[PDB]
Amino acid sequence: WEWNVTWNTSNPDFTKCFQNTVLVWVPCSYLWVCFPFYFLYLSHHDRGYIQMTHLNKAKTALGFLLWIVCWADLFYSFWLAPVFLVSPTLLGITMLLATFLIQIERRRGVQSSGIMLTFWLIALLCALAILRSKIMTAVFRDVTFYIYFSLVLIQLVLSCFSDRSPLFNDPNPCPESSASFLSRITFWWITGMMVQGYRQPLESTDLWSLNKEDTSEQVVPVLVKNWKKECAKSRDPSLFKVLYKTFGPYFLMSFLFKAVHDLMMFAGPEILKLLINFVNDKKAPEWQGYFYTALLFISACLQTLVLHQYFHICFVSGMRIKTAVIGAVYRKALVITNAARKSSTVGEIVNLMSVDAQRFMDLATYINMIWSAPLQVILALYLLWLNLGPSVLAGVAVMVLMVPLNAVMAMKTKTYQVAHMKSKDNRIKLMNEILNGIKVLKLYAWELAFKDKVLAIRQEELKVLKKSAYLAAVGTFTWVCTPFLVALSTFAVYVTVDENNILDAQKAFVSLALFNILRFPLNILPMVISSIVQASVSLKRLRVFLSHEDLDPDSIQRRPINSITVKNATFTWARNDPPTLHGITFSVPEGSLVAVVGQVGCGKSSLLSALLAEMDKVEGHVTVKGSVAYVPQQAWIQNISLRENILFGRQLQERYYKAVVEACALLPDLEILPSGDRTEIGEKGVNLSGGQKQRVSLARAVYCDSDVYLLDDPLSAVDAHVGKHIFENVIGPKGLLKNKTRLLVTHAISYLPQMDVIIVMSGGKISEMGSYQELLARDGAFAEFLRTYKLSVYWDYMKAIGLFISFLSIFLFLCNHVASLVSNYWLSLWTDDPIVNGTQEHTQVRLSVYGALGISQGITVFGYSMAVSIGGIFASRRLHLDLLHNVLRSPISFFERTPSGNLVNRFSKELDTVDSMIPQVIKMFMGSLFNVIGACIIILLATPMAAVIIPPLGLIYFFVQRFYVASSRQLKRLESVSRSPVYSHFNETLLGVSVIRAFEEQERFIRQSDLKVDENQKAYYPSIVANRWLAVRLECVGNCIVLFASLFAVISRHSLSAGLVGLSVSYSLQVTTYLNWLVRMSSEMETNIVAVERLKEYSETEKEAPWQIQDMAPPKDWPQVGRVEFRDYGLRYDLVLKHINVTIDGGEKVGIVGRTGAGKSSLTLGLFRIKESAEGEIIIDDINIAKIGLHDLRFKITIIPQDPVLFSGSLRMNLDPFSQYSDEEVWTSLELAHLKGFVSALPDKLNHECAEGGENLSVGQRQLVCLARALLRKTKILVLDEAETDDLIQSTIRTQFDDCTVLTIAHRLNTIMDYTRVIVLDKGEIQEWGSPSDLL
Ligand SMILES: Nc1ncnc2c1ncn2[C@@H]1O[C@@H]2CO[P@](=O)(S)O[C@@H]3[C@H](O)[C@@H](CO[P@](=O)(S)O[C@H]2[C@H]1O)O[C@H]3n1cnc2c(N)ncnc21
């Protein structure tokens, strides 16, 4: 080995000794160190044995021949040089290990081998090096090497194909367990779903099944066993030891991958330095440059692959951790004791299964960086120290200064997040009031007053939004300025400290790239530490939960079908609490009806709990015989259909089910319910009354067909007749359970004489049990008891911002881009200056221009960021105003017809998406896009002839981005949807655990929780593999960019300078992260901007007639006398109102009578123009209503509706939202409304803060407040809608409103009789038109 023929030569040939020693020791050596380790995996992991195939044999036969050929060399050598003996024998022996290895891999079930692939690849490269040397040298021993190389190449090609699957069916399988090594490395096996997801929108059944190891049925038992072993071995069992003993061995493979990734990441800058030296070192061979470029490419590709495999390992381990923790928590919760369960909140345990398990899932990613981040940083620092000197300390002095500052920013906006949120809550509250009370507002035309309050709350919100906006600007400013800041600081210090310090390309750009690989190892440290602390508290929470005690099954001697036996048994609800049932003894024979009798808190329900092993048995002997059906006091209802509630996971028997349903008198309940017995009962579905829930619980118990029934007050909530019917057909001796041992807890005497045995107790003690007649004859405790009683959406958003602001932001951001680019170009020009008299010709003016360029970059970064901040706030204001106007201008038919509920999330969730997320997303997406464009242009500018690589790589990027965004924003939705049922099922199980355990159906519910967690994992796993697929494709694109940039710089290093090549390579190295985040941000934008599209709704939705016409406005006293005339009125709704020709004279009391379905109420809607007249000419006095603007008439006519709607705020704002009427008028109207006494009583006087809907006020008061509103209006036309205070409101409407014309729609004839001229409506027609005297 000497440098003349290997390094400094036109023809670089490895020396003969090097060829025969190191190039042969490398591959043979690889298999020798891996062989032992590989038995661990081959042994621990097995999948059967693969059959005898031609491929496997072909590989084995070539392994035999290859060994022979290599030993044939030893034979010829035997037929001087020491290397001609040991090397052939070593190669033959490692070859014999290779063929044995494919043999054992067949035995252990391996379709494709990564070892048997990397090993052949390394051997091939070594053979290639010797091959080239041997063909450049030119029979005797050469031909043996050619045969060896050809066989090795064919072996390598064979090793790529995947063998047949073993005899270990698998519908919709996961191709991970069947794909070959190359597909697993490149993650190609998911591209199928990627293309298919782009064409056919994914559903829950298209998702692949889970591999056997990820199923909860294979990860929960191992954790359960390990935790049991630790618990039985122990003081204070530790969950962390269990965790790292159970899933640690699979996790430790991440360590190697992380170390290799770190080393390969650092290998980049070293090769960059070598290339910068090469371009500066003219008169050097081109072979060195091409070797350096190939080294860069191979290192980058290998680092990408290893890192992405590391990512997959960590995510799979986290998924297993989550699944196992979920399963163990479920089983523990099903086992733990009531005493230990009551202390912890139910919501606490649900949080235990949600937030702590999710934190454990996410922790697996940032746990290796506990050592990767420091070492990286340290190593990077050392390299930087090797490069420049102590001055670099000042260069990083600001990076470490950004870690706290940025943190301080985030925490700050969190407080802002708390402020904004608070105001938003108020806003939505107010909006909710308007949404459920839009009827009253339109009637009084108070819409604009409420719009003003909404705008005031919006101003309050936008103040905090403006402050957060200004804070966000500097956060972006620092992020973009960091690179320039570190470069300028370190370079200025380096130049100023000593004039002999020469700034070369290697001394500027290598340290510049080391700064880029320093940003990440340092900025993630706070996140890592915070996640570790949260995971530690989660470990504490899980450990204390999993160490809880449990109920004792031994307490009850459950025996297969003297039925219930208790002797001298005392039970507790806790270990230290006193007994609740002291010294209980009783024997219940088979098929006997026993009633527990006592007062409240006696211990009746405790007896049934004790028979189910729910109480803590401190002493005694209980021998319940046969299956037990428990009807609890608090009915537990599953959210499944009523049929499956009664069935309870049991085979449906139509005759038995139909005998059970009516015997519980559940037939009326089935009839009222919409779908019958298929209705979704429970908290989530249709709510049921308590009696119905008790009925369903009893029906479930009766269907379960147990021999022993424990009925803890099944008839508490059912009525007396229903209860007697139930007892007759179910519990009584002539019911369904005639031969069943029934034990009932009751406090009702009605069925007591029919009971075979009455167990009467007092204070948890057996007190003279016996039969009813005998107990009555004894006249003791029982007698005492008885005696007790789409590109256009982007343009729309730009218009909402305004064209000027958007254009200015784009221009300033382009200015930032050009400033950064010219900063880089200035650095390149600066690094190329010659050295005269031992110092650069120019070094102060270059620093000044560098500083000026960077300061300009910083000011424009802070500027355009502030622009979009103001723009975003402007757009939020304009969009909210437009949406509010469209909503309030729409007719009532819109509110009635629209799904009531889709407006609320539009005002709350989508508006929140607009004002906060959209500006941040547009900022970071635009930044990433122009970072990519800047990398491309600085590559193309420095090397003009590099435009041939842009088209293919752009096509690859476009295809990958299209497929990923389309197929990932759907997988995320699938996973989100699937997550909720797990926590819902845990809530159901937690709520019904006593019933679950009593029926002994805990195994079925354990299996059910298996399915839901597996379903969630089936959608979560493709998402992370999708991220990996993005990752590999985009890093391949970036590595191709790096390779082509370096290649095109090396091919023309002469017409180029060192600094230009350095800058090109540094930016090409950076471009990969920018590309990845550009795709991720584009996906974010695509699913985010649609909010604006759904906020631009109701833009054309038919609106009401204009509120103010102002061309045909009425006079101030429009209702001069109040002469109403319905001239052929017809109201569309086919026609509810038809042929209405009536005349109500001014100041004449008129009422409207009719049955349900008539046009009584619709007639009022005619007066106020709620629905446009299909055919009609209603005219008040001498003016048509349809011509008048809505507000005008709605202000000149008043209505007292069915249910008065009192809005949140003061009483004065309820009476006069506009505050138009003076305080004296309000006081007079309130006094005239029989409310002066009450209104003077509130401490806040007229400013009494009434809650949502006036909950604090009574219904009578709210009605009188509505009457006060009508009285304060002082209008000549008033309408009344009648449904205790009726006497008061009727007298008040008869007191002073006699001057005004009053229409009255009352469902009661008593009040209408007083009003003359009654109009009767049969089906919209005027049945009778005359006074009540003419009516009778
Ligand atoms: N191997 C690696 N080496 C270098 N860095 C790596 C990395 N892997 C991950 N990153 C991260 O990718 C981003 C790289 O920077 P960019 O891609 S140039 O821009 C960021 C990014 O686009 C997104 C968030 O990406 P992010 O996860 S937060 O963090 C950084 C970086 O830490 O928004 C931008 N961004 C970040 N902060 C701000 C801000 N205050 N104002 C405006 N835009 C901001």
UniProtKB/Swiss-Prot annotation:
Expressed in heart, spleen, lung, kidney, skeletal muscle, mammary gland and weaker in brain and liver. Keywords: ATP-binding, Cell membrane, Glycoprotein, Hydrolase, Lipid transport, Membrane, Nucleotide-binding, Phosphoprotein, Repeat, Translocase, Transmembrane, Transmembrane helix, Transport. SUPFAM superfamilies: ABC transporter transmembrane region, P-loop containing nucleoside triphosphate hydrolases. Residues 264-289, 388-390, 495-516, 820-856, 942, 1056-1057 are extracellular. Residues 40-59, 100-111, 164-242, 311-366, 412-473, 538-798, 878-920, 964-1034, 1079-1336 are cytoplasmic. Glycans are attached at N4, N837. The chain crosses the membrane at residues 19-39, 60-79, 80-99, 112-132, 143-163, 243-263, 290-310, 367-387, 391-411, 474-494, 517-537, 799-819, 857-877, 921-941, 943-963, 1035-1055, 1058-1078. Residues 251-534, 806-1087 form the ABC transmembrane type-1 domain. It catalyses: ATP + H2O + xenobioticSide 1 = ADP + phosphate + xenobioticSide 2; an S-substituted glutathione(in) + ATP + H2O = an S-substituted glutathione(out) + ADP + phosphate + H(+); sphing-4-enine 1-phosphate(in) + ATP + H2O = sphing-4-enine 1-phosphate(out) + ADP + phosphate + H(+); leukotriene C4(in) + ATP + H2O = leukotriene C4(out) + ADP + phosphate + H(+). It is a multi-pass membrane protein. It is found in: Cell membrane; Basolateral cell membrane. ATP 1 binds at G598, Q599, V600, G601, C602, G603, K604, S605. Disulfide bonds: none annotated. It is an enzyme of class 7 (translocase). This is Multidrug resistance-associated protein 1. The lineage of its organism: Eukaryota, Metazoa, Chordata, Craniata, Vertebrata. The gene is ABCC1.
